[PDB]
Amino acid sequence: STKKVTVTGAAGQISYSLLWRIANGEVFGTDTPVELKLLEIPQALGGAEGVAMELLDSAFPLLRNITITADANEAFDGANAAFLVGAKPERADLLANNGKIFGPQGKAINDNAADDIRVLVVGNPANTNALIASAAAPDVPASRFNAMMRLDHNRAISQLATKLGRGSAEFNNIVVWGNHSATQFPDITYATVGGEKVTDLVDHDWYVEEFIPRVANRGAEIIEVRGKSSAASAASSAIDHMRDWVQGTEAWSSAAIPSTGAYGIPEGIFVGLPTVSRNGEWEIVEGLEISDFQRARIDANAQELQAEREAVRDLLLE
Amino acid sequence: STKKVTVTGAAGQISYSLLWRIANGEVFGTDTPVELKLLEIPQALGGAEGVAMELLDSAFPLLRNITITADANEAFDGANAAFLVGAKPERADLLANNGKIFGPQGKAINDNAADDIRVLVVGNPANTNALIASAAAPDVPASRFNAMMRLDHNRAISQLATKLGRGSAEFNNIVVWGNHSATQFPDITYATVGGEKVTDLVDHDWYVEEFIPRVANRGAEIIEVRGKSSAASAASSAIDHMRDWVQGTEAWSSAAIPSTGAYGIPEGIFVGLPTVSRNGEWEIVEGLEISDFQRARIDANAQELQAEREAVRDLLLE
Ligand SMILES: NC(=O)c1ccc[n+]([C@@H]2O[C@H](COP(=O)([O-])OP(=O)(O)OC[C@H]3O[C@@H](n4cnc5c(N)ncnc54)[C@H](O)[C@@H]3O)[C@@H](O)[C@H]2O)c1
Ligand SMILES: NC(=O)c1ccc[n+]([C@@H]2O[C@H](COP(=O)([O-])OP(=O)(O)OC[C@H]3O[C@@H](n4cnc5c(N)ncnc54)[C@H](O)[C@@H]3O)[C@@H](O)[C@H]2O)c1
């Protein structure tokens, strides 16, 4: 019952934190054996050999095989899950410079991966990289591509937990709507902490003017204090996302999934939405009411995502 | 029922891989809340503040609090478990330079930790650093201090797995006797795989002349292929040791524990031994027969540990 798991950018900072928490059985379960398929660029293939050697040396009982390649067809062959972490850390330059990676990777997924493939895009810009990847994969349902907004979601929960002196575990119904950028909307409209509305426990003006920018700009705060961008927390958030996708969760998880036209967000973009996992599928929470406050922030994110889609329109292979 | 866990060298490479696999419940169990107590030297507090920020951002349900300090009394206050990773990179000079750290840290554990304290010493030279820390803790049983030989043990099982095309988990009764150095003795005398003796499956001369130095010099091999000593695999092995210590194992684990005089090893050193974990204690496997082959290699390790102990004799506080 071996799960084949591809990780791109395997010689990078995020992957170094990621791979030990796939191998330990955290994602697919402690009784599910795994094989790690590492993809890098030719220049970083030596880096990737060193990490395969450290993985072997860890003697993970569930880790049955480790393959290292610069060939996307080899890396995605039989893949049941993929973490597309590989990318290089002006905005138009980044959309196109990383955009051109995800078309070929989406094609390689399309042509080589198992029927049950699930793909999480971590590489920035995440939501538009998932669009490009999905558009090169006409034989794979769009819903098998997600972009990661779980770091934003985890940072929102963590800031709420420090503000109220409560446990992170105690919060329910956090949504981070939209794009993985400074436009993101960490939304506490439905949030509860032990029977009580969170909106009852925090000053609305503090939430709008302090909490939203603190979460939305947290990555810059990490670079300031650390000297380089987050890695362990980004990997942690990717492990949470794939674990919830695969095992299921009734906790709202802020999966960035293909827009269906729900909540007046147009089709053709990948968006943070209020999302639960059942039978290996994300489901949009239906029947929520949208305030004018909410509407302005959700439409700001939808609009930004359509801007990004038009910037990379010629990188859409199909 | 919150476990307080101290990690020293918290701004370093190993701790960066270690802390996410404590916070996730892997060590004490998925129902046991944890508090992380990070200790660093003054010049690295900024770094450890970075790490505490990413830990918070991960929104671990079991992580109830994170403390950062340069004061060893604060770091060890009520500690239930400790990972002593903090250390600096000629042997006589390394023994003294890192030796002078572990005396004070043992005193700090003695004066401040909970009754149930368990201490794993990772910082090199590991076996002698455990001796020094234990000598500075007269009110703590010496058996609450261990040195990490689990990476050596994990490497031995992984090279056996490669050589025989078997899963790492299929191996039983592996022991790495002695010191965490190039003198270590990965011993297959008792080891089994698929109901056969490992010694019936490998050439004795390859084992002695290829396998032993490959395991014993693997560190140098990692520094070679990566340009950076192992971190992720060192952390993974530290997780394995503490998990096994706390949760129990029927598998021999190679804990470096205080010599009782078993197998003709003199008392007063910390030495890798054939060891299983029951009810929170390492138990030496008794009644094994020792061949002349084994005796030479066990005695060479015992004698090296007596050399090291004599080199640091004036650093023993009590
Ligand atoms: N929440 C999120 O979505 C989130 C969080 C943090 C970081 N990120 C992003 O994750 C990505 C990786 O971050 P990092 O710190 O690991 O970067 P890194 O520089 O440490 O690692 C990236 C690795 O990807 C490799 N790579 C480049 N092109 C590749 C290709 N075509 N195929 C495979 N690998 C390729 C590089 O060789 C490098 O080893 C960046 O885009 C970063 O901005 C996203
Ligand atoms: N199997 C093993 O036992 C094993 C395996 C690998 C490495 N190691 C050892 O583990 C240690 C850590 O390796 P690393 O890669 O994390 O090193 P690193 O240099 O990346 O990190 C070491 C950290 O310890 C800190 N430190 C120094 N003196 C300290 C003190 N007195 N109190 C608290 N913190 C202090 C430093 O500031 C630094 O942040 C080294 O001694 C290394 O040789 C042992």
Author numbering:
A (entry chain B), B (entry chain A): 8 to 96, 102 to 330
What did the paper state?
However, the MDHs from the major microorganisms employed for SA overproduction, such as A. succinogenes, E. coli, M. succiniciproducens, S. cerevisiae, and Y. lipolytica are clustered together with the mitochondrial MDH family, whereas the C. glutamicum MDH belongs to the cytosolic MDH family. CgMDH showed high activity at relatively acidic pH and the highest activity at pH 7.0, whereas MsMDH showed the highest activity at pH 9.0 and dramatically reduced activity at acidic pH. At pH 5.0–7.0, CgMDH exhibited significantly higher kcat compared with MsMDH, which is consistent with the results of the optimal pH study above. On the other hand, CgMDH activity was reduced only to a small degree due to relatively mild substrate inhibition as reflected by its high ki values over the entire pH range. Noticeable differences in the substrate (OAA or malate) and cofactor (NADH or NAD+) binding sites of MsMDH and CgMDH were found from the conformation of mobile loop36 and the lengths of β7-β8, α2-β2, and α7-α8 connecting loops. The β7-β8, α2-β2, and α7-α8 connecting loops include a catalytic histidine residue, the NADH-stabilizing residues, and the OAA-binding residues, respectively. Presence of a protruding Gln20 in CgMDH was also observed at the pyrophosphate moiety binding site, whereas MsMDH was found to possess Gly11 instead. One of the variants, MsMDHG11Q, showed 2.9-fold higher activity compared with MsMDH, whereas the activity of the CgMDHQ20G variant (the counterpart variant of MsMDHG11Q) was reduced compared with CgMDH. The SA production performance had significantly decreased compared with the PALK (pMS3-cgmdh) strain, indicating decreased catalytic performance of substituting Gln20 of CgMDH with glycine. Fed-batch culture of the PALK (pMS3-cgmdh) strain produced 87.23 g L−1 of SA with yield and productivity of 1.29 mol mol−1 glucose and 3.6 g L−1 h−1, respectively; the titer, yield, and productivity all significantly increased by amplifying the cgmdh gene.
